[PDB]
Amino acid sequence: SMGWAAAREAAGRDMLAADLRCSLFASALQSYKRDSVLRPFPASYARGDCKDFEALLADASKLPNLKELLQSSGDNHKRAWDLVSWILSSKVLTIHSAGKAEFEKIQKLTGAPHTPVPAPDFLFEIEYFDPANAKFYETKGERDLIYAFHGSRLENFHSIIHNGLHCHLNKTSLFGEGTYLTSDLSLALIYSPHGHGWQHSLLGPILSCVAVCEVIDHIPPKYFVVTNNQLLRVKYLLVYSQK
Numbered sequence: 001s002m003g004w005a006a007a008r009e010a011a012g013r014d015m016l017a018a019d020l021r022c023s024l025f026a027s028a029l030q031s032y033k034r035d036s037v038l039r040p041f042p043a044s045y046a047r048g049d050c051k052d053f054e055a056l057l058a059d060a061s062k063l064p065n066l067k068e069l070l071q072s073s074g075d076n077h078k079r080a081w082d083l084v085s086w087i088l089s090s091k092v093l094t095i096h097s098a099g100k101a102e103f104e105k106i107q108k109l110t111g112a113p114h115t116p117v118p119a120p121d122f123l124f125e126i127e128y129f130d131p132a133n134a135k136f137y138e139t140k141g142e143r144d145l146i147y148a149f150h151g152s153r154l155e156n157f158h159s160i161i162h163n164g165l166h167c168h169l170n171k172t173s174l175f176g177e178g179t180y181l182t183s184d185l186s187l188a189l190i191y192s193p194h195g196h197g198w199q200h201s202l203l204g205p206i207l208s209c210v211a212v213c214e215v216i217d218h219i220p221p222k223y224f225v226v227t228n229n230q231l232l233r234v235k236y237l238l239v240y241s242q243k
């Protein structure tokens with residue numbers, strides 16, 4: 001993972017994106033489903049197979065807000081900087097705050113809404129690095145990209161960002177295999193109830209989040225299903241902050 005000085009620079013470049021990542025980490029950690037949804041898990045809190053969730057919950061509770069972490073601390077917050085450095089580290093991707101200009105663009109790409117939908121409070125774009133970025137464009141070849149929504153409980157988004165959407169392979173289920181997506185945000189939103197994020201977040205403590213996926217083309221509103229995880233990636237996050 002990045003060292004502290006590098007993490008401080010990365011967080012300073014985009015405080016809201018860094019905050020989002022700390023918020024989604026807190027949501028996955030605080031969930032009763034932490035065992036399955038906090039993946040990836042920070043290795044410094046694991047003894048081989050044994051994940052020390054109580055030590056991690058305690059240290060997450062001691063994190064100051066990101067403004068305090070950056071503006072004073074250098075060696076005032078050793079454990080905090082170790083954890084936040086890990087949260088903000090990835091060789092695969094990074095996240096960028098985007099403007100309400102970008103929400104219009106998302107509507108243009110997904111379709112004019114058939115149903116009234118709320119505008120997100122925050123919008124983020126995921127940028128992929130190689131090899132994952134080149135691999136996705138290799139898989140795409142000349143096929144078109146379509147943009148579709150996938151709602152989920154807040155405590156799944158740490159895993160969704162780092163691992164992609166779960167593409168279930170269970171012929172043993174009512175819903176069968178695949179990832180469900182829709183071009184109607186009002187249908188995706190039903191799958192994105194408010195959850196608890198981070199009490200020290202710039203975004204606010206209570207968030208809903210909807211993924212916008214890039215899919216390689218290959219009443220109620222209409223949904224579709226993708227069974228091959230190489231054919232989609234999460235490209236945007238729509239974040240709604242409860243008032």
Ligand SMILES: O=c1[nH]ncc(-n2cc3ccc(OC4CCNCC4)cc3c2)c1C(F)(F)F
Binds near residue numbers: 151180182
């Ligand atoms: O955003 C989403 N987040 N998670 C789930 C999900 N999704 C939509 C569904 C519609 C219907 C259905 O029902 C089955 C269909 C087969 N037969 C038995 C019932 C399951 C769905 C799961 C969506 C969406 F809208 F993008 F697709």
